Design a protein around this ligand. Structure first.
Ligand SMILES: Nc1nc2c(ncn2[C@@H]2O[C@H](COP(=O)(O)OP(=O)(O)CP(=O)(O)O)[C@@H](O)[C@H]2O)c(=O)[nH]1
Ligand SMILES: [K+]
Ligand SMILES: [Mg+2]
Ligand SMILES: [Mg+2]
Ligand SMILES: [Mg+2]
Ligand SMILES: [Mg+2]
Ligand SMILES: [Mg+2]
Ligand SMILES: [Mg+2]
Ligand SMILES: [Mg+2]
Ligand SMILES: [Mg+2]
Ligand SMILES: [Mg+2]
Ligand SMILES: [Mg+2]
Ligand SMILES: [Mg+2]
Ligand SMILES: [Mg+2]
Ligand SMILES: [Mg+2]
Ligand SMILES: [Mg+2]
Ligand SMILES: [Mg+2]
Ligand SMILES: [Mg+2]
Ligand SMILES: [Mg+2]
Ligand SMILES: [Mg+2]
Ligand SMILES: [Mg+2]
Ligand SMILES: [Mg+2]
Ligand SMILES: [Mg+2]
Ligand SMILES: [Mg+2]
Ligand SMILES: [Mg+2]
Ligand SMILES: [Mg+2]
Ligand SMILES: [Mg+2]
Ligand SMILES: [Mg+2]
Ligand SMILES: [Mg+2]
Ligand SMILES: [Mg+2]
Ligand SMILES: [Mg+2]
Ligand SMILES: [Mg+2]
Ligand SMILES: [Mg+2]
Ligand SMILES: [Mg+2]
Ligand SMILES: [Mg+2]
Ligand SMILES: [Mg+2]
Ligand SMILES: [Mg+2]
Ligand SMILES: [Mg+2]
Ligand SMILES: [Mg+2]
Ligand SMILES: [Mg+2]
Ligand SMILES: [Mg+2]
Ligand SMILES: [Mg+2]
Ligand SMILES: [Mg+2]
Ligand SMILES: [Mg+2]
Ligand SMILES: [Mg+2]
Ligand SMILES: [Mg+2]
Ligand SMILES: [Mg+2]
Ligand SMILES: [Mg+2]
Ligand SMILES: [Mg+2]
Ligand SMILES: [Mg+2]
Ligand SMILES: [Mg+2]
Ligand SMILES: [Mg+2]
Lengths: 133, 76, 418
RNA sequence: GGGUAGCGGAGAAAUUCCAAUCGAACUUGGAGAUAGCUGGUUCUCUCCGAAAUAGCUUUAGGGCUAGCCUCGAGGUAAAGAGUCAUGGAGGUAGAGCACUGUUUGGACUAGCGAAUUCAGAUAAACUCCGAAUGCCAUGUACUUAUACUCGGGAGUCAGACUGCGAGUGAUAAGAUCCGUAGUCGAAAGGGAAACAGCCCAGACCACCAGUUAAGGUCCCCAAAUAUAUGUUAAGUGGAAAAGGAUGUGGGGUUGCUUAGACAACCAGGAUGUUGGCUUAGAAGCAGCCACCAUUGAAAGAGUGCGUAAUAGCUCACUGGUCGAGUGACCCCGCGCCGAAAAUGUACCGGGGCUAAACAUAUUACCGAAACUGUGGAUGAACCU
RNA sequence: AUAGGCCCAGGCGACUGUUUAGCAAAAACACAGGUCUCUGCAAAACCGUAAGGUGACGUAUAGGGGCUGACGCCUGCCCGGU
RNA sequence: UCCUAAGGUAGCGAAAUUCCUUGUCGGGUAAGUUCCGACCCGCACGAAAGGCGCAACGAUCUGGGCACUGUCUCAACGAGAGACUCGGUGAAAUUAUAGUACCUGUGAAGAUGCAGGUUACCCGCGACAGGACGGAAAGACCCCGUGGAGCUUUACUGCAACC
RNA sequence: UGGGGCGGUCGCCUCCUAAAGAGUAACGGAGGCGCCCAAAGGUUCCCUCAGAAUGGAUGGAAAUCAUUCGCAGAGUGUAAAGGCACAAGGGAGCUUGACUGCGAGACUGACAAGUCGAGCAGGGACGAAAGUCGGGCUUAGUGAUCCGGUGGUUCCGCAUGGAAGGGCCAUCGCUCAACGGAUAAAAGCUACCCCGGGGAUAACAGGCUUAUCUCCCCCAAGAGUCCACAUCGACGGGGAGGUUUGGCACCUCGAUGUCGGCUCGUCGCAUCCUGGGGCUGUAGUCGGUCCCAAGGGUUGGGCUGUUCGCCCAUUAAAGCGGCACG
RNA sequence: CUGGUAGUUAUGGCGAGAAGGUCACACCCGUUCCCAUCCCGAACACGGUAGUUAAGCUUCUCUGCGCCAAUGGUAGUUGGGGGCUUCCCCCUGCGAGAGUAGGUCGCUGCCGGG
């Protein structure tokens, strides 16, 4: 998941104070993963979690991803000093505040849903919980 | 490594130069702006680069014309 | 997205030089790159400084700047000085065939055995090239004088030592992994199951043959092996049981494909991987008979087997894709050659018949008399050997069947003389 | 015994030699060369007391003007500071999708797919909205002591850490660069074991007087082996995460039970029938399709072990003996594992502690150069 | 008591000689030989303001300067630029 | 065929020259990143700043042998001169005052001297060097100063000399 | 100037950072300027844009025409921001105010400079008056002094009349771009080097940090002849250590000797051998993996200055690290 | 009652449904004249009034859109104090945006005519 184009190539890192602005309720499916803490979540982590939870269900039901990696971050190589401008972009990240629902699923029974969400939550750097509509 | 940035312009010190309810003398500058962010009112003139100035002696009043706009006047 | 590349080649007295550029274009198309132009030069010797000569460099630069390319790919291995010169002359990025194959292998390496192999191959390839690459920073001309305080060494020694060190660590991890791998072969070696291995060129049809055989003669036949045209599809070896209708057991293994003009830093990885084929009991050489160039392929195939170190193993040359050819009959056996189509029941029947004929040849006739109350041996005979006829006698069961020497020795008490 | 003399001589050439001196000898003079650099600069007490910033600079460890200190003198329609009331300018935090970018799932679609709609997201350089604070004025309100102008004399232009708001960096650094407040600098005293910058608090002098602050009250070591109600068993307290777990306490739901529950003990656990197919077999228990009926309290076309198939063992289920509870889930408190480094215990200052630990509430005392008591010295302003 | 250790093979410099008094003895300098160039005699060149000198009490088979460095085989193409 | 003033000839070549490089093959050794002989993809040889050879010569540099041995395995004994004790004579570098332990910590971030602990009767003589960031020499490296000196040139401005 | 060098930059304008007044730094994130216009200036009068649907020859999705919807989705010389539909946008008529002398009072500001300005006088342009006009919707489009050139002038003019020469007013001559401009005029080497200073600032070691590094784990798709967990384990996730490659510049420049070896060791345990054990894809033999365990032990040579490494021959074994790389 | 002309943050607007009149207003008829069209008496200008409320205009009714808008809660935050510091918690004062109860089919002034 990468944006097709951006207005600017560099951006401030921001902060993560407060509860999530919107998206704190299950709105499309029956089950969801909710963030209990705040964290940067990259697109590799999203992809790994999605593949795990989709493979467990054998391509049955539906999955909604409720977060997008809009923000970019940069870096500097080993051996360069401080200064001489900002570094080059590396990846894309989504800042997720506490209370945000980040994955929803539908179309499967209790056991399959809960086990798929448990398998997905182990790929993520944030502390999660499972909620039902 | 190079930045290719680093330029800026000198600040121009815009905004309100006198207070609401203050007594002011003729010719005093009341407000500096780009465009008519505030309009000239009674006894107030608009300069060539949009500067608002007092034309007489009196007290400054910032007022609200029709819903979306503002103006400033000077009353003896 | 997709990068625009160019491919550059010299005749170099190669016998074909055309299939080489074709497969180079195919390899580029397997790395999310597309060929927007090729340059060839018919020079019998390679230029020492730029690999193509002075004028060809300008021609290549003009074509790249007209076609808007981002990288140049050279058909042969380059030299560090050649790379420096070409990069300075072209003001672009330069890459060679070895780098391309390493790039193909790196992103298809899933199991960490392959990942570590590609990692060590990449570091070995880049180790000689760092000299002039790092000299630009190192050759700062002005650094100092005598100091009475310092490292007692020159920077070149220090960075040489640093780059030398990590190679040993990576190779050590490789060796530990291979030693751990030898543990999982203990059961196979302790027993004496015959092993037959499929080898050949890429996209020959090895995986399809294995999948057909597994579907025909396996218990857990749902265990299939991936198949596709693409490129190096299988990067790992697989082992499966095959049990024949006459109650015989063997193990079938599948390995990776290779291509011509193979790097020497990666042939070590292939030699590590083909260690199962090295200790095989039978070899099956799959050849794409449809392709006109198939003949050339066969030769280069043996070359690879000559380098990894597998020899003196009986080989049956199987010619796949018989259905794609008109006016041909199959399956057919001629000497040690088989003509057949992998996606056929009858072709697989013929191939497995040939395999059974070749491997098992010491199964001779023998007659046994198993007493009734002292039974539980007829079950062993029926589940470990193929029977012909049995009789219900008053004193017991009189069986006749064809068996192996181990069964004869184990059942030596029940034999009856004639 | 003689010749070549320093803007010079000699050199089979090394910057080699020209009186222990040579990329340009020695001596005297110009001469006290110049040194925006380092070092040094000698008696006492009283009052006040900084800066480490802006701009320009062949400027960057130098200077100049301004800012900040001190001394003297002036003038008032009292101009300085705090709070209160009132009026304004201004788009940050938050929020939102009305514009602009980024973006998810449907319906519909010009033709897999542009638009329209439905629902749902996101923003330093988006805004239909929009604070708290801070800022500018007015007042006759209440309190409080400066403010300004002119002149003489300066020093300063390396700052540091801590809290809060940002950038850079890796949402590293006792990092770097700004904004805002504090302390150090230039500040002693008490507490943090020791410990510029943290917490408390500003030393005029003397006393073998009192009360308090932060921090404390078992011994080192001054003061509680204090009071009440609970928690913890790790020395947790006195170091460390994702994950893992019948530790332990407090709540809230729910099933069965003295017409007998749960656990053990006794007995039964059968018949068509080896259900059909497949297999050399397949008899409940390799595998596929079915899962009925009878007696009876119940008893599976079988829960597991066992044979090669059997055989054999066991369970589901029912009756019998004793007669009190028993089994599922949710929330909260404190604990457990994960947990490894180099001279010597060495991750409470020590001894030691099961409270001398933790939670809630309460009350005495100790504790400073703070404040008070008594006696001295001294500056300013204003009065007699 | 005093009185050569020897052999095989390679780089460099032909050789004897000279050198950084007091850190470097050499593969560096010199060298015999080669070649280019200047100079008709009050020679060119060099010292000196000059006078006066060296060259030389010499006269192109002589004298000054540059480069190479015994000897053997050799020393190719370019006169656009300076 | 394009361009150039013209496109490196002979000879030699992993070299006092080769980055990759311990190039590849062979010799020599049980084992040879050095050495010798070949090869030629000469990063970046080359013809009087001479190319390639060469008998004799060298306190030159490099590799291998015979002989020889305390160089070594691995050290032992003996002689003399100092050291050591006694009589005579008698300095120096250095030095803020000193009744001058160890461990863990703290601190301008590496403590004899600060904290908490652990050891420790007073004064010497012969030895050894872990510390006193030991002594000696206002760091030669590095940076700075609108410091200096020697040298270069198609830097600037000059001067001699010559035409 | 996160040592100096290399690279980049040096003056002016617009936005973000900037914390809702103004101001505010970094070799922080983004873009422009060194002009143009004789109308694209002044005034008087008039009126309104982009796009879409529909209907029609060449004509086509889009050229011209007609109706309807249409708050600006257009335009505004040019970058951006703030403005503007009572136009500051678009047409037409007449014009030269893109005037001369000034200027109460303010903004900005160390200075030098920069910005706004009602109103007064002279003489005008356009309008029937009222009235507007000292360039352009606003904010960039620029360079001090000294020295020279040109035009004007009821100024001076070394005994006197003139003249030569000056003064005053207007204007011209700078990539003086290192843009407050040292001179009218200026590039390099020092390993032959010297003096004054600095831990204000680099090279060794110490300190902080832990991206990288070494080690240990969580989930479990897969491999393992069936079989996630004998042995391994992808995509992702979490820590410990302080030996690597780095970052910072806190002690030391009135000196903290810097690689390898030799001599002499001592400590940690993440254990190379030996001792005890659990699991095994443990029949036996030979092994694999994990737990306890630091008592002792842990080789001689060839090549290379080497550490490392490769090779020869052994051994029960030929451990890995700290101590100023002891 | 109507014509003209002002003020007032759309509670005043958009949309829909009807009534009315040459007293005023307008549409309408014409182009000799002043004046006009990059062409057109459409508009502008002028000269009259056969027909008309069809439209503008005036009056009345609708909440469909639009606009206005509480209360309580929540976010944020000045000051004071703590943690286990990607951040969080407590006390005091201030206090949104969104959403909603509800409001709205205007209200005031001067002049000339009926
Ligand atoms: N007509 C025909 N096509 C065949 C036959 N056998 C195989 N193919 C085709 O050739 C392809 C073979 O692919 P595959 O067997 O996976 O190649 P591979 O050998 O595994 C390549 P790798 O070495 O990377 O594993 C298949 O996609 C199949 O469609 C045949 O007998 N006839
Ligand atoms: K998680
Ligand atoms: Mg150097
Ligand atoms: Mg001299
Ligand atoms: Mg010499
Ligand atoms: Mg000398
Ligand atoms: Mg100072
Ligand atoms: Mg101090
Ligand atoms: Mg203190
Ligand atoms: Mg008690
Ligand atoms: Mg985890
Ligand atoms: Mg609990
Ligand atoms: Mg029971
Ligand atoms: Mg614990
Ligand atoms: Mg713990
Ligand atoms: Mg523990
Ligand atoms: Mg601790
Ligand atoms: Mg205690
Ligand atoms: Mg008193
Ligand atoms: Mg007193
Ligand atoms: Mg007094
Ligand atoms: Mg010499
Ligand atoms: Mg001769
Ligand atoms: Mg000569
Ligand atoms: Mg003579
Ligand atoms: Mg001559
Ligand atoms: Mg000469
Ligand atoms: Mg020459
Ligand atoms: Mg000769
Ligand atoms: Mg060899
Ligand atoms: Mg050899
Ligand atoms: Mg050789
Ligand atoms: Mg030679
Ligand atoms: Mg010779
Ligand atoms: Mg010879
Ligand atoms: Mg001789
Ligand atoms: Mg000789
Ligand atoms: Mg004596
Ligand atoms: Mg003596
Ligand atoms: Mg002590
Ligand atoms: Mg003593
Ligand atoms: Mg200077
Ligand atoms: Mg000198
Ligand atoms: Mg205009
Ligand atoms: Mg000048
Ligand atoms: Mg030199
Ligand atoms: Mg270092
Ligand atoms: Mg260090
Ligand atoms: Mg010093
Ligand atoms: Mg050796
Ligand atoms: Mg052994
Ligand atoms: Mg060490």
């Amino acid at each position: 998941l990468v944006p097709k184009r951006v207005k600017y190539r560099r951006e401030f890192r921001g902060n993560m104070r407060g509860r999530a602005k919107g998206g704190t309720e299950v709105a499309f499916g029956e089950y969801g993963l909710q963030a209990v803490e705040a964290s940067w979540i990259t697109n590799r982590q999203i992809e790994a979690a999605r593949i795990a939870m989709t493979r467990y269900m054998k391509r049955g039901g539906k999955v909604w991803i409720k977060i997008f990696p809009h923000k970019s971050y940069t870096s500097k190589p080993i051996g360069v000093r401080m200064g001489k401008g900002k570094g080059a972009p590396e990846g894309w990240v989504s800042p997720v505040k506490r209370g945000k629902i980040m994955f929803e699923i539908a179309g499967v029974p209790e056991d399959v849903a809960r086990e798929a969400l448990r398998l997905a939550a182990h790929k993520l750097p944030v502390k999660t919980k499972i909620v039902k509509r | 490594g190079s930045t290719s940035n680093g330029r800026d312009s000198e600040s121009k010190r815009l905004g309100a130069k006198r207070a609401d309810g203050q007594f002011v003398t003729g010719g005093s500058i009341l407000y500096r702006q780009r465009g008519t962010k505030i309009y000239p009112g009674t006894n107030v003139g608009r300069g060539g680069d949009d500067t608002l100035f007092a034309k007489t002696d009196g007290v400054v009043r910032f007022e609200r014309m029709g819903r979306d706009k503002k103006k400033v006047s000077v009353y003896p | 997205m997709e990068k625009k590349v160019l491919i550059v080649g010299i005749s170099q007295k190669q016998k074909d030089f055309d299939y080489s550029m074709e497969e180079l274009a195919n390899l580029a198309a397997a790395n999310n790159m597309e060929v927007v132009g090729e340059i060839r030069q018919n020079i019998d010797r390679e230029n020492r400084a730029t690999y193509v000569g002075k004028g060809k460099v300008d021609e290549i630069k003009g074509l790249a700047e007209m076609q808007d390319a981002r990288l140049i790919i050279f058909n042969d291995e380059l030299s560090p000085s050649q790379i420096r010169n070409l990069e300075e002359a072209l003001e672009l990025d330069v890459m060679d065939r070895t780098g391309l194959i390493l790039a193909i292998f790196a992103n298809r390496a899933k199991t960490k055995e392959a990942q570590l192999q590609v990692q060590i191959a990449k570091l070995q390839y880049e180790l000689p090239r760092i000299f002039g690459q790092g000299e630009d920073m190192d050759q700062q001309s002005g650094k100092g004088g005598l100091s009475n305080r310092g490292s007692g060494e020159k920077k070149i020694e220090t960075d040489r030592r640093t780059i030398k060190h990590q190679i040993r660590h990576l190779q050590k991890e490789l060796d530990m992994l291979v030693d751990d791998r030898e543990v999982r072969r203990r059961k196979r070696k302790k027993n004496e199951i015959p092993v037959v291995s499929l080898v050949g060129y890429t996209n020959a049809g090895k995986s399809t043959t294995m999948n057909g055989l597994v579907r025909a003669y396996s218990e857990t036949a749902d265990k299939q092996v991936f198949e596709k045209d693409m490129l190096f599809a299988t990067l790992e070896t697989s082992v499966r049981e095959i049990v024949l209708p006459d109650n015989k057991q063997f193990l079938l293994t599948d390995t990776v494909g290779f291509v011509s003009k193979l790097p020497h830093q990666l042939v070590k990885a292939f030699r590590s991987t083909l260690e199962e084929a090295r200790d095989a009991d039978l070899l099956i050489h799959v050849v794409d008979y449809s392709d006109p160039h198939y003949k050339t392929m066969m030769k280069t195939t043996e070359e690879t087997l000559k380098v990894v170190g597998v020899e003196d193993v009986p080989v049956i040359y199987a010619y796949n894709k018989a259905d794609l050819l008109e006016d041909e009959m199959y399956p057919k056996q001629t000497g040690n050659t088989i003509i057949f189509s992998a996606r056929e029941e009858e072709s697989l029947e013929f191939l497995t018949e040939v395999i059974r004929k070749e491997l098992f040849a010491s199964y001779e006739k023998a007659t046994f008399l198993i007493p009734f109350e002292a039974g539980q041996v007829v079950a062993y005979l029926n589940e470990h050997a193929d029977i012909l006829e049995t009789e219900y006698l008053e004193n017991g069961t009189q069986i006749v069947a064809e068996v192996s020497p181990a069964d004869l020795q184990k059942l030596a008490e029940y034999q009856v003389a004639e």
